[PDB]
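Inputs:
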Amino acid sequence: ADLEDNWETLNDNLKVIEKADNAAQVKDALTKMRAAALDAQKATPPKLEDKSPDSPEMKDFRHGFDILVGQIDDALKLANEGKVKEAQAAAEQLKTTRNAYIQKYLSWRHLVCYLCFYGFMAQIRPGESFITPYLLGPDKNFTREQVTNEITPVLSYSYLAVLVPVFLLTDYLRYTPVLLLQGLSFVSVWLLLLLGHSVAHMQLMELFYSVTMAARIAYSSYIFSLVRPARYQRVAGYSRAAVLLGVFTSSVLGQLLVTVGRVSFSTLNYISLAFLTFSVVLALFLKRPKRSLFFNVLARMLRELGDSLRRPQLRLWSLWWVFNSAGYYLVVYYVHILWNEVDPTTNSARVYNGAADAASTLLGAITSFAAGFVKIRWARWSKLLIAGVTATQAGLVFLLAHTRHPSSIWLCYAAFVLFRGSYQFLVPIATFQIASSLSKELCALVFGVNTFFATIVKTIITFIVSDVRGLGLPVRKQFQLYSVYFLILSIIYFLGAM
Amino acid sequence: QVQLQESGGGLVQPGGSLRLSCAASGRTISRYAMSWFRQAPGKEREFVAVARRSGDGAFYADSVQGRFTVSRDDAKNTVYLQMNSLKPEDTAVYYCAIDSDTFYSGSYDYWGQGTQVTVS
Amino acid sequence: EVQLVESGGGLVQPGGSLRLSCAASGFNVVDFSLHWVRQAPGKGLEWVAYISSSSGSTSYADSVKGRFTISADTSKNTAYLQMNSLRAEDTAVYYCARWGYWPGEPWWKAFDYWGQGTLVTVSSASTKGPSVFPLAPSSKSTSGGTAALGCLVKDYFPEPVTVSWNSGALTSGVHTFPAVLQSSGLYSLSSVVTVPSSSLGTQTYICNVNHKPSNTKVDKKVEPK
Amino acid sequence: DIQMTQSPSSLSASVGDRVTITCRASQSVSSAVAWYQQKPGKAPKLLIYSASSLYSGVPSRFSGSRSGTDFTLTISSLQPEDFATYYCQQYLYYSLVTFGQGTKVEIKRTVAAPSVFIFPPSDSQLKSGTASVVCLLNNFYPREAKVQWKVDNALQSGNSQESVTEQDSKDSTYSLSSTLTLSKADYEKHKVYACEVTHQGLSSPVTKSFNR
Ligand SMILES: CN1c2c(O)nc(N)nc2NC[C@@H]1CNc1ccc(C(=O)N[C@@H](CCC(=O)O)C(=O)O)cc1
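Outputs:
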């Protein structure tokens, strides 16, 4: 409420004055305008903070606010004399001063629209779900074993390898060069996907892709650091909606290019790289904040962390988040290989993986809109809902496991959409029940450490199940083992629910 | 239906110190004003001190000015009486009263019981 | 040096008319604005009206709207506040203070150069002399300490009356109370001295009052009954 | 229009004491409020302007602060010249000038018992038609007392008329003189004529009476 909220209530009072008639009672409106104008004259602007005071570039700011308050005087002088038609004159004078004097030293006036446009456009990667048909076609000719047991476990290890140090370098660099490195990493991933002939090329591609997969939390913290806490709720809601709309638009564009447009995979990846270049340009046109999470006190945070470790609900939902997130990430990693294994058809028109991705994103958004409306306390439906939904997920993984019929790929897609709708109903519930306990720095720390535990568990299960130096199990037996693993998890939470 | 429960007092050393207390139950203190009385044998019902509000000060008598100290704890409904430099000319039974006016005019309805204070 | 001065404030009738004057010696009335500040007797300060000689911005308070008028002349270097149809609430003290224009430091400086302040009053009662009554000391009971002794002047108009004891001799213990407004429209006032008990009936105390508008000088003697 | 409240309306402090005079605003008025000092009878003087600055001419023992819509005056050392009434003057526009309420600071002094002195009506008041009985309170502190006229042991509201005085310069004490203005019904009404006044220095209400 230093300077920007005064301008916000000034714009709100302008909206009160403009579109409303009966200017005999806009005297209160004009005097609130005058109070917000006089309160925002010496309120230490951030652009003026880098400049020294008593400077000739500072006298323009004070002179502009002086002539603005003088125009408020000239408006209220005629507003008190019974003339009700001078409110439009006050609005035109405020428009001229907005064009001339105030906004030159203020910030950008379309930051919400620009952040929503970046969240809509940087998530458009129209060759996302078509990486696995591109790796198993006549263009590159990689087998199922080379993409199953040699490429994607290196993704599983690399997401552990770049989780902690990239985030530790991210929290210090104020989140804009991290997004620049993310855009360069998307450029590197799609160039190694294009210019790649061996297994090591796609291995390095997944190594660069792990950073882009890990920069989500970085982008959310960038939203938190750019936007004031009195503004963060609505802006974060529109930014999350813009990211979800961008992902859905990306999958719909992939279906319209592959199925409807009949675009070949090379031209598809070329247009994907074009949209990545637009994303790199939009990352170049960003605005860097000044504050960060843990680099712009600590004993109080450690005390409030130690005063919540004895909570059984926090540890219970944290361990369930770790196990369910590890299992979900393994299923999402291997489900495209499962889809190309069940239906090994070479026709690109019959490949409907992007349609399953779009339906999964849509049903996840529907179940996430209906997850914040779950105002159920922890006294009655804590463990039973967990056991039932994980039993449903175990049944869906079992249905995906023994699917061997060629024409049952639609049933396989519907089972995956039901699996995504069962998982994405759980994320806002756990996020609400855990995030509303401590401070926001402690919230980010606890969710980051829980993500690190989930990554450890995913790395261990990847080392056990799908490693060539350990057991070396075939992929159908691997999905059967995942089904047995979810069944054991369902039995454990069913015995613990009582 | 309220009452004024007090404590403190007793045979203290001449020239020493003492902490009086006067709690009240049934109605809060922070919107009222409490006083302090003194009844020596031979005279009756002298004045000691008064506490007006939370943001105001205390007001003393002629012979106890600058010697006593009136604290006030409205969160516990117990107004203390810090007391120093006990002379043997104050050997009396200290009282405690409550005012029944927000304008502190001095409407004294409920009284205390007494506290035996003897110096040497 | 610059200053302000007020004139034109005396006694009027309810429903009559009265004009004020605020001669601004020194500074001009076009570089700074002029104002009017009311103070009721016993109450606090309050605002009435103003005028700006630059453009004309005569805006009034809620209690004086549609009843008073204001005028400022830039040649005579003064300000006028013409009033008509006055009521009993207007019995107060009127001030006239400087307050500058926007922008700059002279706006943020508040009412800094005030005036002497004029006194207006609204009453229907005519000017009459006070009826001086003595007050007996009544030393028949509760004697030994001190004994009070006073006078009681009432039913007089206007305000200023001076009560002197022994023509200014006895001054230790004189408590001349302020003139309280009687509900019948006149004024009343009490004065009292502190006479020692050893010289109650011995020394003779006189009670000298002086009413300046209505020419009377009543000197009464007080005695126990 | 807008209001400007001012809470500590009756302060008392000795020479060399720190006082705080708060002033809460109604709307979100910016850093533009003033502080005055009016002696009884004289003109107000500007003391603080723009809620933090000191006016050119007054000594440096005055200051101010700003906490949102809560403005507070502070005094470091209380001069005996500084015993007056302090006003809270907010200024935002020419025609929105509303004041405060006024805080009358007093000299801190010990509580004394009021010398309750009653006066019978004189022999000249009964020949005029207006009987006036008065009760004198003298040499007490502070001002807040409450005299109650008892006719047939009951309250008589509407017929009393109080008049407190200013502050004495010798011992900083006060005086009060209630005046029960009545008609010639002093005879045919009840023969009891007593005023019951209460005070913090008085345990029992000292009631002085006269008859016949
Ligand atoms: C294309 N496919 C793939 C593949 O087939 N083979 C390899 N080696 N690597 C990859 N990597 C990418 C992809 C499968 N991997 C992932 C990894 C993570 C996600 C993911 O974060 N989905 C989110 C999207 C929602 C959101 O964050 O907004 C979800 O909640 O469902 C989605 C897919």
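Remarks. Chain D has no helices and 16 strands. Residues A 128-129, 131-132, 151-152, 155, 206, 213, 216, 243, 247, 332-333, 336 surround THH (CB under 6 Å).
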